[PDB]
Design brief:
Chain lengths: 364, 49
């Protein structure tokens, strides 16, 4: 609303008043006036910074900057009187600041200068700098990878509030998938620093643990990034095909180093939902066996799980275990099993058997 | 027989399933103790498809 010069003269008179207040500040009623003067002074500091910021934005094409702001935020700016701007709506302030830093970071100019200007006028500097580094990393082989790793360290340093979807998206634009992976896992770890989600899931996701459920959900949101990246890789692998497929393979062989038990569980859930049961047999995970036996006893659609269990145990050469698995699978009263598949199982059973057990044989 | 059909799915890779199934089921019903390592190769190859 105010071009830079009126704001400069106003800041001149205002910082003059501030000088007076600081100079004379040492010189039920008195304490009351002291509270009122303290409020006046703190508001004055807020107002000096605010007018400096308004001039800062108007000197940098205010219309374009707030044009990037949200239309609802623009309308709220239309109804906001600057008294409410300084007093109550720090959100519009942070949003306009982010909008200007975003204008700069999309214009691919260094953010250090605007950052120092902000820190000097209304103390987002390091955030803007990292943003510039990342966005420029799309326009820069060895050096590109180096800058990608540096932006990765930067964005994982602030992994609490980093917009994981957009960061991973720009990391997908430069084929820097390892960045998306490490950033997803770092955001997960830092988001739930105690692992309340793992205790929740391990306790059976009992409904009473709102905090455990919440931390698990936040880890899930973090992992959703790597999930989407792998899904895009596989989709473009099927539509280039082999390139995005190697993207998928590299993403997954990365995610297979992951030690988060709930993450292995979710990965299993997705993969089985993804019908890649071969890749399921193809990767080493502790919880698979557990998660399997659990789901098999708990899903009530056990047929799928139990078959997969006989399979996996076979691939691990655990003959008698897979044996008993398929054995129950066959015996199970269920309408989804016709005599044929039953006998075919019992066959595979005796065969894995010849591969106490003598009793099992005698029974069978 | 199963080694052959295996190589068949091998070349097709590098019905066969239902045929292999018929063979394994035969092995099971057969009132004669085939040798052990026999059963071993049978089960393993039946899996690897």
């Amino acid at each position: 609303s105010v071009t830079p010069q009126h704001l400069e003269s106003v800041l001149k008179e205002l910082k003059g008043l501030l000088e007076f207040l600081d100079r004379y500040s040492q010189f039920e009623a008195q304490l009351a006036e002291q509270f009122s003067l303290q409020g006046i002074h703190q508001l004055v500091r807020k107002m000096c910074q605010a007018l400096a910021l308004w001039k800062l934005l108007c000197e940098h094409q205010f219309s374009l900057v707030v044009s990037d702001l949200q239309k609802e935020l623009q309308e709220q700016l239309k109804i906001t009187t600057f008294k409410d701007l300084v007093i109550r709506d720090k959100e519009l302030t942070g949003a306009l600041t982010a909008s200007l830093i975003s204008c700069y970071i999309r214009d691919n100019a260094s953010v250090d200068g605007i950052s120092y200007r902000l820190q000097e006028v209304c103390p987002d500097a390091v955030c803007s700098k990292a943003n510039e580094l990342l966005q420029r990393s799309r326009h820069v082989k060895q050096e590109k990878e180096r800058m990608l790793r540096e932006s990765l360290k930067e964005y994982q340093k602030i992994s609490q509030q980093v917009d994981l979807p957009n960061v991973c998206a720009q990391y997908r634009q430069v084929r820097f998938y390892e960045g998306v992976v490490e950033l997803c896992l770092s955001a997960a770890e830092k988001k739930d620093p105690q692992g309340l989600g793992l205790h929740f899931h391990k306790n059976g996701e009992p409904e009473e643990d709102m905090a455990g459920l919440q931390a698990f959900q936040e880890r899930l949101n973090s992992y959703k990034c790597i999930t989407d990246t792998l899904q895009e890789l596989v989709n473009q692998s099927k539509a280039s095909n082999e390139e995005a497929g190697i993207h998928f393979e590299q993403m997954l062989k990365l995610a297979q180093r992951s030690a988060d038990e709930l993450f292995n569980i979710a990965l299993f859930n997705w993969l089985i939902q993804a019908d890649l049961t071969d890749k399921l047999l193809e990767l080493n995970s502790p919880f698979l066996e557990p998660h399997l036996v659990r789901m098999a006893k708990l899903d009530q659609n056990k047929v799928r799980y139990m078959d997969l269990l006989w399979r996996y145990y076979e691939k691990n050469r655990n003959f008698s275990n897979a044996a008993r698995v398929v054995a129950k699978l066959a015996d199970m009263h269920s309408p989804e099993i016709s005599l044929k598949q039953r006998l075919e199982y019992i066959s595979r059973a005796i065969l894995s058997a010849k591969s106490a057990d003598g009793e099992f044989l005698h029974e069978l | 027989t199963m080694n052959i059909l295996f190589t068949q799915y091998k070349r097709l890779k590098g019905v066969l399933r239902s045929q292999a199934r018929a063979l394994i089921t035969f092995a099971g019903m057969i009132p004669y103790r085939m040798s052990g390592d026999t059963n071993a190769r049978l089960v393993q190859m039946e899996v690897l498809m």
